[PDB]
Amino acid sequence: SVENLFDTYKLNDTITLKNRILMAPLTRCMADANLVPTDDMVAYYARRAEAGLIISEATIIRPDAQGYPNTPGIFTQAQIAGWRKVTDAVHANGGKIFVQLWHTGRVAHPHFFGGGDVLAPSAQKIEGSVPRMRELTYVTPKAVTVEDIQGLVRDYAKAAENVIEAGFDGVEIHGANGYLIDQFLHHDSNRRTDEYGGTPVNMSRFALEVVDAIIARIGHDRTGLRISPGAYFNMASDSRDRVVFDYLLPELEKRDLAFVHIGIFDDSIEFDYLGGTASSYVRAHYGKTLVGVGSYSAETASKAIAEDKFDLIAIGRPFIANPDYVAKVRNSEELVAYSDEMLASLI
Numbered sequence: 001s002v003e004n005l006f007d008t009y010k011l012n013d014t015i016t017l018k019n020r021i022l023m024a025p026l027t028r029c030m031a032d033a034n035l036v037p038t039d040d041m042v043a044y045y046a047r048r049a050e051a052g053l054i055i056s057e058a059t060i061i062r063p064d065a066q067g068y069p070n071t072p073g074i075f076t077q078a079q080i081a082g083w084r085k086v087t088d089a090v091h092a093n094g095g096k097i098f099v100q101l102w103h104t105g106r107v108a109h110p111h112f113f114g115g116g117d118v119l120a121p122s123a124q125k126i127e128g129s130v131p132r133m134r135e136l137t138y139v140t141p142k143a144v145t146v147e148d149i150q151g152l153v154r155d156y157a158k159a160a161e162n163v164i165e166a167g168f169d170g171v172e173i174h175g176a177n178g179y180l181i182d183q184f185l186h187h188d189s190n191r192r193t194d195e196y197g198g199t200p201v202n203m204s205r206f207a208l209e210v211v212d213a214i215i216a217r218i219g220h221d222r223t224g225l226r227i228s229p230g231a232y233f234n235m236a237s238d239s240r241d242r243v244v245f246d247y248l249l250p251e252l253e254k255r256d257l258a259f260v261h262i263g264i265f266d267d268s269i270e271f272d273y274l275g276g277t278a279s280s281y282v283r284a285h286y287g288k289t290l291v292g293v294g295s296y297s298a299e300t301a302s303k304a305i306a307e308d309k310f311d312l313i314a315i316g317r318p319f320i321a322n323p324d325y326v327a328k329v330r331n332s333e334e335l336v337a338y339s340d341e342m343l344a345s346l347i
């Protein structure tokens with residue numbers, strides 16, 4: 001039985017979720033070429049509004065954030081208007097939705113923004129090329145200056161202000177999976193020797209500046225953050241990264257966020273440097289609402305939540321395979337298994 005998944009969950013004084021099930025953020029690359037959400041995306045999200053909370057696909061904050069084709073933005077008026085169609089439709093169906101705000105950092109590709117500079121904490125190139133694209137080889141990033149950093153914080157904040165007009169309930173800051181914010185938090189990507197590098201305090205500075213700037217625009221109750229304390233998504237591991245997160249997590253607790261959300265693919269994996277699973281590490285170092293994710297079934301998520309391992313469950317691949325995920329779980333019905341072939345269709 002997975003009855004506890006259907007518990008009402010009060011995130012805070014501003015937001016109460018009708019159940020504990022989140023739709024995980026899932027990049028689909030189906031926006032129009034000007035990165036405006038389509039009416040097909042409106043339908044896609046609307047039919048998943050039985051989720052207690054939808055986290056949108058990663059949504060870019062400005063042009064040099066783009067690393068994959070046709071990923072939506074939220075920096076133009078047209079993009080804002082497209083998103084407002086999405087959020088209105090979700091709300092009309094009794095749902096709630098946060099936008100996931102993205103900058104890909106060194107994982108951006110200049111093909112998408114007219115040959116400009118790829119930006120990152122340090123000039124450390126990742127291996128390879130953009131998935132499902134013809135020969136878009138990753139390039140050496142420019143190490144951002146302090147002025148670049150100030151502009152990036154400004155642009156995260158502006159994107160968050162835009163979320164109000166776009167009608168979202170809030171923002172999940174994409175601090176995970178080796179993208180820009182996560183690049184500051186890990187030693188592979190952050191080799192800086194200024195006030196943004198070296199020490200746990202310095203390496204956490206960019207993340208906390210973005211969190212605080214966004215809180216200043218939309219409030220702590222409407223602000224969540226995804227993190228990846230481990231590596232292994234466009235990120236080489238480093239035994240020193242854990243102490244960054246040991247510092248960051250209590251600092252985040254001070255902000256009384258809507259939630260912290262782990263960004264991994266299989267939470268059954270034990271990470272050497274975290275002394276165990278990602279969720280158990282975060283749970284040991286962070287005492288507020290926590291969203292677990294990664295290869296959970298409704299049954300294993302329910303048990304984890306009953307065991308106080310985390311509070312909310314994000315479901316990704318099954319939500320692609322099963323738009324009616326929540327109803328099927330509610331009715332104890334068979335779920336279709338996900339396959340990558342499903343990514344070709346937006347349903």
Ligand SMILES: Cc1cc2nc3c(=O)[nH]c(=O)nc-3n(C[C@H](O)[C@H](O)[C@H](O)COP(=O)(O)O)c2cc1C
Pocket residue numbers: 024025026027028056057058100174176177226263264265266293294295296314315316317318343
């Ligand atoms: C096709 C695909 C796209 C994804 N896009 C995002 C994304 O935009 N932002 C994000 O933080 N995670 C992204 N993820 C990670 C998922 O949010 C989730 O953490 C992962 O799929 C594990 O959960 P699951 O086992 O329930 O699918 C993506 C995963 C997949 C498979």
Ligand SMILES: Cc1ccc(O)cc1
Pocket residue numbers: 027028029068069130131132133343
């Ligand atoms: C779903 C997807 C994600 C990335 C990409 O480059 C292409 C397709």
Ligand SMILES: Cc1ccc(O)cc1
Pocket residue numbers: 146194195
């Ligand atoms: C002007 C300036 C400010 C900070 C810094 O780290 C370098 C230069």
Ligand SMILES: Cc1ccc(O)cc1
Pocket residue numbers: 163164167168169170171218222
């Ligand atoms: C993000 C947001 C949405 C509504 C609102 O009233 C304030 C902020």
Ligand SMILES: Cc1ccc(O)cc1
Pocket residue numbers: 027058176177
């Ligand atoms: C394709 C993708 C995009 C973002 C992310 O965090 C994970 C996977």
Ligand SMILES: Cc1ccc(O)cc1
Pocket residue numbers: 014218219220221222
């Ligand atoms: C009044 C208010 C409440 C929540 C919030 O995020 C912003 C403003």
Ligand SMILES: Cc1ccc(O)cc1
Pocket residue numbers: 340
């Ligand atoms: C990043 C990714 C994409 C597809 C997939 O099936 C797993 C992981």
